[PDB]
Amino acid sequence: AQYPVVNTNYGKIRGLRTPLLGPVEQYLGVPYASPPTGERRFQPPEPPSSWTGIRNTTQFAAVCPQHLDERSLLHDMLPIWFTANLDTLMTYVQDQNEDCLYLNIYVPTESKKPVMVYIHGGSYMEGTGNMIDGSILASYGNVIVITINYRLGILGFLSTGDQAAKGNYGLLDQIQALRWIEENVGAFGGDPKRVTIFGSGAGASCVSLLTLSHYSEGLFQKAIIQSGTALSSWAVNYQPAKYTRILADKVGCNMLDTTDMVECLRNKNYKELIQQTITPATYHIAFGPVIDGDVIPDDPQILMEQGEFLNYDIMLGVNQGEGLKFVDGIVDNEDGVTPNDFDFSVSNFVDNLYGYPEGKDTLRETIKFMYTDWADKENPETRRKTLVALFTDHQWVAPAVATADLHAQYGSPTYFYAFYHHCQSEMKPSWADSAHGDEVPYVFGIPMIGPTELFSCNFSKNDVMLSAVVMTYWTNFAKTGDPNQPVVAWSRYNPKDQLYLHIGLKPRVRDHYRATKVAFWLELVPHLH
Amino acid sequence: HAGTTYIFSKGGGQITYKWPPNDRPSTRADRLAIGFSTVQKEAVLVRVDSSSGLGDYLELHIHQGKIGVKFNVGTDDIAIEESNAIINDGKYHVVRFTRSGGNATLQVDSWPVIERYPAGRQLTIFNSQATIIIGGKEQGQPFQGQLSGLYYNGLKVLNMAAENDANIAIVGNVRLV
Numbered sequence A: 001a002q003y004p005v006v007n008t009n010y011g012k013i014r015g016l017r018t019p020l021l022g023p024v025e026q027y028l029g030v031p032y033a034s035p036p037t038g039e040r041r042f043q044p045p046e047p048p049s050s051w052t053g054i055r056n057t058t059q060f061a062a063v064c065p066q067h068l069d070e071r072s073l074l075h076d077m078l079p080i081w082f083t084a085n086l087d088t089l090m091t092y093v094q095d096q097n098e099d100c101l102y103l104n105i106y107v108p109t110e111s112k113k114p115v116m117v118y119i120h121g122g123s124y125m126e127g128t129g130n131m132i133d134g135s136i137l138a139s140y141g142n143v144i145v146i147t148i149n150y151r152l153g154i155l156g157f158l159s160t161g162d163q164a165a166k167g168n169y170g171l172l173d174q175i176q177a178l179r180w181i182e183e184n185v186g187a188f189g190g191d192p193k194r195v196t197i198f199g200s201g202a203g204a205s206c207v208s209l210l211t212l213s214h215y216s217e218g219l220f221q222k223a224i225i226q227s228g229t230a231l232s233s234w235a236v237n238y239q240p241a242k243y244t245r246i247l248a249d250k251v252g253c254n255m256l257d258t259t260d261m262v263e264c265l266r267n268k269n270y271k272e273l274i275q276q277t278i279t280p281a282t283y284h285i286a287f288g289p290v291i292d293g294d295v296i297p298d299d300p301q302i303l304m305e306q307g308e309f310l311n312y313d314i315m316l317g318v319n320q321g322e323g324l325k326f327v328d329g330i331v332d333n334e335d336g337v338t339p340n341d342f343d344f345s346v347s348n349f350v351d352n353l354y355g356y357p358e359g360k361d362t363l364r365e366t367i368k369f370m371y372t373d374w375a376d377k378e379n380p381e382t383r384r385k386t387l388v389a390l391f392t393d394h395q396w397v398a399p400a401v402a403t404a405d406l407h408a409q410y411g412s413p414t415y416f417y418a419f420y421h422h423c424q425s426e427m428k429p430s431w432a433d434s435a436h437g438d439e440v441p442y443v444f445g446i447p448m449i450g451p452t453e454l455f456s457c458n459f460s461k462n463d464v465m466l467s468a469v470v471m472t473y474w475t476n477f478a479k480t481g482d483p484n485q486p487v488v489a490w491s492r493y494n495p496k497d498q499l500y501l502h503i504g505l506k507p508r509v510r511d512h513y514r515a516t517k518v519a520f521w522l523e524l525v526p527h528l529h
Numbered sequence B: 001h002a003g004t005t006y007i008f009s010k011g012g013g014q015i016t017y018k019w020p021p022n023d024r025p026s027t028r029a030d031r032l033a034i035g036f037s038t039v040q041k042e043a044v045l046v047r048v049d050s051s052s053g054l055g056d057y058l059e060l061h062i063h064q065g066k067i068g069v070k071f072n073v074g075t076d077d078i079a080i081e082e083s084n085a086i087i088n089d090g091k092y093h094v095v096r097f098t099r100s101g102g103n104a105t106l107q108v109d110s111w112p113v114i115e116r117y118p119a120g121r122q123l124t125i126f127n128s129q130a131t132i133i134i135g136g137k138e139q140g141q142p143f144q145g146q147l148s149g150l151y152y153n154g155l156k157v158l159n160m161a162a163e164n165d166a167n168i169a170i171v172g173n174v175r176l177v
């Protein structure tokens, strides 16, 4: 009972029965594909090998290769809990191997259960599904939770912009995991006809991209897209060849033929590859999803504008102050920001995201105007909030709403949230509002257990209850396509009323989340160019 | 005519399947088949409509005694016709339609498969399928004759209508032979 065994289509695995809410059966380090090593580096993943006898899946496998280094790290894009706690985080990635396509299954003891599959990721360069324990969400929701590992960074996303290396290996890995799940979850008491995929940040970007790919067909029916989209500056790499070349030249693969260049890269030791510094343009990525024409068949903006996606039940949202890091270094003793720093900050923003000469004097002045509280224009703390708002609006809210509108417009059931809570901690200054990543502890029930090394929050009864509310909504959605239904009412989102749930201690339905600011970014700023 | 047959008499009638609003399929490929008999030169037989606001649709019809399908998935109307087999003769016939993005097939009985390959780039998704209307009353071209063996993307719609499925509304002069 204690070490339960499940016969998968590749052979039997042995897991653990773990108490915490009933106990959960944990199957850790399950292989879902063949190692993408040797000839199969920079190739699509292949199914895994089968075996006779019983295979212990009772501890996490080696993680995918990654080199965590302040100054190589994409700080602005990583969630706060990651960057705040990176010593005790390097702990989860210290055991690496190119052979890393493994997933983990959390099965509640208690017909056929819904399956929530989590796609982790901050910047496409780092992480592991292993740092999220799915046990509480599984046991609380009576759903199977699966976490995955997919190829990261270079090994996961290197592309030449031609046939030599088409890219998207990490996305293909997520697809292969979902194929495994479709064919094998039944054996764990899962229902393949009720698979919700979900993720936060770059993981959310993957989830959005996967909803646009023909490869996803039949592999899942619902998605929850937390704090990321396919439309941000950092979701997709539009200039892969450029960065691949910089890498190749650094490691001595200078051949001009892209086919020979890839084979040379393919024979290099991976450690040599990940140790290099390839720094991308501000707010962009050097290695990540690319528009290859097959997996992702066109610019996601175009695909979504045009309605080229199937009908997934979709839930998406954003946190109040995602963009905390945008005010790094300019907040004073009194938690304020000066006018000169406000100007400089908007000026640099314009240079980084709208680098067109000219028209940018205009744009800069307009942005400043839009992000000044004309009813309290002297208050330095408000100046600070507005700056965090500028970046949060631009990188997260505007594209989330753009995405929500287009799903809703083509008839897919859509649900939108604004997350206005976060735990008290030292990971973040006390004046900060909910930052990038702060929802994660609530989605996964962490308050139900206590603070952990990654989330060293001081939780209150309120935190426990808000977590209960969030998990109920999330798992209800997994069950029925409606967060209100297991077999406060959160109204559906359509672009007419644009109702959304304000998630906080007191949840409430509201409408047109920051509509004027979203309009500013989606409507005015484009004209003006 | 095999299995569940419905007769459509003078003045017209209709059989409507509504998808639950939380579950309207979007498809990249479709498949439609039906058995029929009619003496009419003009009728709409079956029509699948996207939700209100969206233009996408698929329509099985008879025009000048010839069976065909007209559909649209976001680019233009695309038409496909069996323009030789006379099918308005009171005798039983089968029509099978296939769509794959902008491309389509049609065949009648054992005649050669008609294929249509529209020129220029084509949208491929039929979004948010809301209703399957059988009978042509709404389109102003009521069908008169018999229908059986309706299959649309796995849905055996006429059986569902025979077994009082919640989502089916039967109106007008239509009888369950």
Ligand SMILES: *[C@@H]1O[C@H](CO)[C@@H](O)[C@H](O)[C@H]1NC(C)=O
Pocket: A014, A054, A056, A058
């Ligand atoms: C699997 O790990 C368990 C953990 O205690 C161990 O007892 C068992 O011997 C291992 N597997 C095999 C095949 O022996």
Ligand SMILES: *[C@@H]1O[C@H](CO)[C@@H](O)[C@H](O)[C@H]1NC(C)=O
Pocket: A458
């Ligand atoms: C949690 O809040 C309490 C309230 O006084 C205080 O002890 C401190 O802020 C936190 N406790 C711990 C152990 O960090």
Ligand SMILES: [Ca+2]
Pocket: A306, A307, B056, B073, B074, B123, B124, B125, B126, B127
């Ligand atoms: Ca369409």
Ligand SMILES: [Cl-]
Pocket: A370, A371, A372, A373, A386
């Ligand atoms: Cl403002």
Ligand SMILES: [Cl-]
Pocket: A513, A514, A515, A516, A517, A518
């Ligand atoms: Cl606003």
